[PDB]
């Protein structure tokens, strides 16, 4: 932004000196340099969003598989299953805001 | 009020600049306000969990 | 106990607002005084160059002016404050336009003679360095003498012949 | 789901000096405030009203001020509530006496023919509206029922009296009749007998005559005294330029109300140039008088803004003589014709007259 | 699923509001993208039909008029003046309208051009604008410099690596500054000349003229310059007229403009007075009295 503001401040002189493309080359180089960091930021936030979206489903799957196989102490009553689902849905919000 | 009652010595003017103090006011106050907003969460969320 | 002492600085300070508001500086607007001040400062040609004139967003975050123009605005505001004491800090060092400096000097002399108020002009203006006004010499962090203009002539060193 | 926070590291740093509000700026010519409307209904808003229950103290006045549908609804609700309360009281009395129980008639029932809440309600209706079928009679061994009957009769009589009084007071109102008065849509100013005057036409539609007619003229404007007083809406009485000075008039046909603009009149320094829309000028005419039918004073309120004044115009004649009587063409109430008059003010007109007199 | 409905709706509304807020700026950007103009091209073959670089400077104005506001209220009215090829001619006018019109017409920057100009015997509107601006040096009213290496700042487009450019830069002015700068030819600028002499713009223009070998030179008004600066500018103009054989000076200083083959003035939207010799301006005492 500082570089492009410097370019635009003397925009008349740059246009009359036919150096617009010469400075635009450096503008593009700086744009690619910032775009690398922007891509890294996008990757990091994609990972964060994926983890946020996939954590509750994975936890529910693990809980159900463990109860069915390792314990097998109940017939998976709906009164327990849907209550656990509602509790997980409620607890999702505080978990992702505590950080 | 502190700015009004602040010395104008160069030892302080060249240390904490006008831009620096403006950024301080813009950022620190806002983040403290957000912390005040989120203060009930730190008291409630662990208990609820 | 200190009153509203008018002050000027070597580094000009401006308000990010209209030129007229910056000059007034939260003071009542008098058309006669404003016209006299702008005529003394010769700021009318500068206002003509500006698109909105005195309504242009002078200062930072807006229209940026030269050091001489900023000094003109600062001295105009200081004069328009109309205080019993006025301080300056090199008003002519930044802008050395001889005609404008002489006009401002004449206007300040007339206004202060009418108001019978104290005015301090800290500058190296050799054009009006010798005058009937009181003078004070500062060197090596001390005041050499603050009295009549004939004291400098009485001293052996006459300011290196006043750069004659 | 969720969202993000207001984390601003530097607010883009360079994000400043945008300006260009591009505001519509359409509020300059939005509208002009009017003290009163063309049909009365003073458009004045009250604020910071500190009431101490006096609004609800005048219950009868509020009922009278209530419209006919609201009055009917209040009447019906009050009567239904009274009937239901009395029916519930009778039902409770019957239950306490035990006559409600479907047992042998060994004991004399407190009230005869009482079988259910429907029967109790029918008995209450008969008692309060004085129907008296007689199948549900009152025994002589129920003193509490006798006292309740007495109280119910007293309450019913009082309610009937109050409702009749409210109905009579509402019927005595004649504001709708007061609305039948007709005033000129736009007023005119023209010279009369060499003197400038502000003319206005007022007429009535209904053939019923209004007695004790009295018209008051005032000017509402912001006036500042040389002492520095600031009056937002200063009201100054305006004489009618009557032959005797009184405001009493005899209005049968639409008459022309004219005020001679003298030196003492506030209109002495007015010009047609300053007669535009956004002008600090408003003429208020208040007409008072009693109706020959109801005997109740009625008030008519009209306003004339500066843009509503027709400088240099004359009202057309409205009354035409017939073979046996006179006729009034009410379709000509608002028709005016131009009158050639000088454009100078009243002050300039008087100055010119004085100069001509001095020269002659 | 019913319990989540309230929070789902709240988040949906909040995100919709945020999306609309951001889409406002998106629409503003898109509207800004609709401003298509400034087509850099030529209505002719630029391979060999035009001259490689204007050197003779034989340009004849044939009733040329220039206007900005959609060809309305032009600052010139059928301007037809015979320039002097192979020599430096400096036209000075009391009003800036003539200088502005000349500057606009030199690079064809005027919105409207009611006339014809034969640039070195060829049309000006039928030539590449980039090449025309590259082969024509011009100075600015105020000193304007970029922030970067002098080698990449003096001739970024040319990208000439010859040491002759550095020699000319060190010889024209600021020899001590060039010597003190560790980079020298490739020394990086400091915030676009934040702390530099006011002659940096003139030195950069002289270096650009030396590098591009622009025969035609364009000069503008000087806001403020010392006597030494004016003398150096005059010496540079003389050197350009000796080597490039063409120079055009536009200013309001009669004493500076007198050092030219011809002098002309334009005011009130038209040509005021044209003086083929330098002494003709002094012959008409009115302009001399107005100047001083
Ligand atoms: N013949 C009429 N009968 C009833 N009301 C009338 C009549 N003429 C005018 N009015 C009333 O005069 C008021 C002014 O509005 P309107 O323009 O209709 O009348 P006007 O200026 O008197 O018109 P006209 O040209 O008919 O005299 C209105 O309240 C209108 O109802
Ligand atoms: O849903 S909230 O009330 N959100 C909200 C933000 C503001 C800012 C105002 C105050 C600062 C200045 C702008 C307006 N007001 N309200 C909410 C409340 C409490 C906890 C979590 C949330 C959800 N949350 C957090 C961040 N983003 C959404
Ligand atoms: K009865
Ligand atoms: K009966």
Coordinates of N, CA and C in Angstrom, one line a residue, chain D residues 1-3, chain E residues 8 11 15:
Chain D
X1 N -24.0 -21.7 14.1 CA -22.8 -21.3 13.4 C -22.0 -20.3 14.4
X2 N -21.2 -19.5 13.8 CA -20.4 -18.5 14.5 C -20.0 -17.4 13.6
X3 N -19.2 -16.4 14.1 CA -18.7 -15.3 13.3 C -17.3 -14.9 13.7
Chain E
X8 N -29.3 -20.8 14.6 CA -29.1 -20.8 13.1 C -29.6 -19.5 12.4
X11 N -27.3 -16.5 13.4 CA -26.1 -16.5 12.7 C -26.3 -16.2 11.2
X15 N -24.5 -13.0 9.4 CA -23.6 -13.2 8.3 C -24.2 -12.6 7.0

